[PDB]
Design an enzyme around this catalytic site. Structure first.
Site, PDB file in Angstrom:
ATOM      1  N   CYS A  97       0.836  -1.203   0.000  1.00 58.49           N
ATOM      2  CA  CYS A  97       0.000   0.000   0.000  1.00 58.49           C
ATOM      3  C   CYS A  97       0.865   1.245   0.000  1.00 58.49           C
ATOM      4  O   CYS A  97       1.926   1.278   0.626  1.00 58.49           O
ATOM      5  CB  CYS A  97      -0.938   0.052   1.215  1.00 58.49           C
ATOM      6  N   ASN A 121      -0.767  -1.343   6.474  1.00 58.98           N
ATOM      7  CA  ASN A 121      -0.092  -2.362   7.270  1.00 58.98           C
ATOM      8  C   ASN A 121       1.290  -1.934   7.731  1.00 58.98           C
ATOM      9  O   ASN A 121       2.041  -1.274   7.006  1.00 58.98           O
ATOM     10  CB  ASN A 121       0.017  -3.682   6.509  1.00 58.98           C
TER      11      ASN A 121
END
Ligand code: NA
Ligand code: NA
Ligand code: NA
Ligand code: NA
Ligand code: NA
Ligand code: NA
Lengths: 321, 317, 317, 321
Positions: free
Chosen positions: D1, D80
């Site tokens: 991400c 994350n």
């Protein structure tokens, strides 16, 4: 393998190579004196006219050199050129036909200037023939140098016979030499000069230490990467003065691009690494080398005794692998 | 600079460093004998109990070491830690107070085990003071090693005093050691094993020579990049047997990550490069070194003649 | 520029390009209908037999295409080949003589199979002549593709006329195509599979996130580096099903290797960047594109209305 | 991400993220209206005061956002932070205790300025507690932004709770944010300006095309490498004008650093790739996104109808993996 040459301020040549291999060939230092028998597969047999020194093996009395250097300051090193090297399947009428292993002594016995070699190669045909049927033909290409120029000799299934001028003074392995020259264009972003502090939208971003101008310089042992790094190091290393400083400069560069034991394992499970580094100084007719397991420089010399011996002088093999 | 240590199959230690600098410091090999006058800025002056050897300069009779190793086989190297290193403004009552330059002799004179060094460092306070106003304080961090373990000692404005175990056996320059350890996880794609031929939608794509598994290994002299490469080489170099082979292995590794003259020009316009490479063999009490302009190995030794000398034995610069 | 092609599971072709430039050219989507006047510099003037669509400009009624695709599903893109491309000084009696700019329409008007194109190219001679003295000759090479095969056409001062099979489905800029193919062997260490935790002499060294197998994949806009990455992505992208998914896959790949505005400044001081990305779907005869400052996909189609028009259908710039 | 933010010339914020994952979470676009019930594990239950939009899932009526943005132009995205993220094993007396999943709505419901968030976080304790026992706790870190500043919130076993100012306007994954900031110092050799022709001991070495100044820019998907590239792209992309150009600029950058399907296979054998890219425009209260298998931009909006609905508005999940 990496071949390297450069000169000092007075035109004294320093020229040699790393031998990066995955097995032991049993090689040792060989001095071939003047007047030693010199057979040829496709030419009149003769005798040596110049003394030469280098690393190699002896096959039925014939010194088979990995690299070798004559008393007049001209040398040659054979490096692997796999997936490319391809020699003629037979001699051609009208050419100077040489089995490819014969180029080492043909060059060093007949020439003192690379300009003459380049002209003579216009009528040379290299032949896919081994010294005897117990040997395979090695798929080599060559770097040849005097104090004024180095040239690269490549014969490939892809491009035929090519002779290049090598202003970088370096050579590694596959692919072909023009490919590596062309690759250098992709590294024009390299700069020895350090970067300095920058503002990334107000965030200070600044070097933590020196070296930042050479971002992207590769440190692995792929032949293209060693070529880039060795060329970059050679053209940026200042000319230095004196035998000790030039020899040290030579080993500094080649130890920087050496293949380090344990860092490369070939597809058969064997370590590939720089087993020896060697430097010939034309000015002193001295062959310097050291080994992966024995770092102190060793020296071997062409002199009035060794150049005029009545047989080969062979130093016993130093063991590795 | 790159510091490096490993052992052979018998637990004999080989430990040393490259010195990468952009100026001449006048250094040479210095043997400091037993019973030599050892002053301290903040402790009782005393004399040496163990002979040591290393590179340094002598300042008013005080041997100021870049690296040094004691006869019992424990050593220490000081390397630059710029933009990070900061020591106390002055001494602190209750602590073992050392001006940062005194830690070289403090460590090599009082210890033979790294386990003891790390225990004693909990009571130590390093002070921002030079030997005198003529010299600036060097912003150093240190690697310390015996045959069993190496540790890194870092004192920063960012993090205070930190002591790390160093299983990689290497140290370079800034940033901090935890940063470099963390960086290694980004290089887990490195593999000494060569790739082999592949089919890219039926186009054969195959290695041209050996080395393809280490794609992405950096070859520049940025400290982070020398750290990665030196660690990768050290942990993959096989253990070798005997003094000759182990000394060669050491120089093979450090010359691979040497800073090559002309390839690095600092912002003041000076060449930065590896001026010397040095290896101390604990088993023979021998300090080996060579230099940028003289590649032959020179040797200097702690023996019954030099360990008991009545002066500093200072070799040439 | 990066050219790209692949097919779905049924043999439907998706083929297009990024245009990476440092200046505005006035281009727009041009549909050239059947039966349109088609002049040639060195052949009998004629008219078009197949409708084509692509990006280009119109010069004195002549549609000058950057890329173009015919109703039968064969296409061609022209990309810069600087320091290499060179065409004949003039026409040569006995050869099919084309000014280099005419090869776009020559190819798309006369062929539906790439196998036929490569056979006809043995009698072709490209001439260094522009449409008129107001425009310079562009130093182009070309990628040509149908659903079965893509080929590269290069004419250089170094090597003459060369035609390569392109199983990677990609093309960028200089150097020559064989150079780029050869370069791929140096990247055989790339692996889509992640690394896992390792022991570096007992120091646990483990990935922090996914992606570690592609260590060393270049992210810059140098043509050699975009070639490597575009080839690696194309051959590892799974085959997907249906028009929507295949069009997205195409733009996913080309936007990954796009030249990003502000990250490349040429030696004249201009930003070079991907001004548009275009995809031709042979199955729907649809040309999709978006632009640096307008990301929504725009669509233009060869249908019975546009293929039979009585003029060029020129969309806006 | 990768999370990304920047503004246009007038201070209009564009803020969003790529979602790079190895499985399908069943997420979809969710609009949470004003006055919707808002329970807290460790605080008084209340109701929403601001409308929010974003991607997520609904768990027993609670919108669990991957990213979300309020009607007043302040947003947050959870990314994350594996091998680092570690939250308190219980609430602490005297703190504002939030289960870590509650930070999405706590931030977007109570604040319009990041400067206020930064001050309030000084008394916040994040707790290792899931919404219910069928869910694990996600090891997240967060980027929060308004039009004036972005901040990074990280709570790690290694460093405790840290709040950073993020002038780069980007965030990826592990390691910690200071590590990535420090890493930028090693890339100071990067330069958007092309190199030009050079002489390597007389051999002409010159760029073959543009781009040579960014030698060493990484193109793989390792979090550190995406961080370097995204930061370099964001700080060098010029400010542009208008909604269309800024949205396009946003997707240009995030599609450049997207994880491409087939190029990353995790240790369990599954493809990891960018399944969606999303951009919230504060000026239009519009959430733009596209998907790996559906490239045309989709739009969803906070307006007088959606902000005042009596229940959640949930768009059905678009399928992937
Ligand atoms: Na003969
Ligand atoms: Na650079
Ligand atoms: Na004292
Ligand atoms: Na005509
Ligand atoms: Na790899
Ligand atoms: Na509650």
């Amino acid at each position: 393998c990496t071949g390297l040459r450069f000169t000092d301020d007075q035109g004294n040549l320093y020229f040699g190579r790393n031998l990066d291999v995955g097995q032991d060939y049993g090689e040792g230092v060989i001095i071939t004196p003047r007047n030693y028998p010199l057979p040829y597969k496709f030419l009149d047999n003769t005798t040596t006219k110049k003394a030469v020194i280098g690393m190699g093996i002896v096959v039925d009395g014939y010194p088979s050199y990995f690299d070798c250097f004559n008393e007049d300051g001209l040398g040659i090193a054979g490096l692997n050129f796999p997936h490319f090297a391809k020699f003629s399947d037979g001699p051609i009428d009208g050419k100077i036909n040489l089995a490819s292993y014969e180029i080492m002594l043909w060059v060093t016995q007949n020439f003192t200037k690379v300009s003459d070699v380049k002209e003579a190669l216009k009528n040379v045909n290299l032949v896919n023939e081994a010294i005897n049927s117990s040997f395979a033909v090695a798929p080599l290409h060559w770097i040849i140098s005097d104090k004024d120029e180095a040239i690269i000799v490549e014969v490939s299934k892809q491009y035929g016979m090519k002779v290049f001028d090598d202003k970088l003074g370096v050579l590694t392995n596959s692919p072909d030499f023009n490919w590596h020259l062309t690759n250098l264009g992709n590294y024009t972003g390299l700069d020895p000069h350090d970067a300095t502090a920058q503002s990334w939208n107000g965030q200070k971003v600044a070097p933590w230490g020196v070296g930042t101008g050479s971002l992207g310089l590769p440190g692995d042992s792929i032949p293209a990467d060693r070529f880039v790094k060795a060329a970059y190091l050679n053209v940026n290393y200042p000319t230095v003065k004196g035998e000790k400083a030039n020899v040290a400069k030579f080993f500094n560069i080649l130890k920087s691009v050496a293949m380090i034991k344990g860092s490369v394992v070939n597809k058969l499970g064997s370590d590939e690494y720089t087993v020896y580094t060697a430097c010939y100084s034309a000015a002193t007719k001295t062959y310097y080398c050291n080994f992966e397991n024995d770092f102190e420089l060793k020296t071997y010399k062409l002199d009035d005794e060794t150049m005029n011996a009545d047989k080969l002088i062979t130093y016993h093999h130093h063991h590795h692998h």
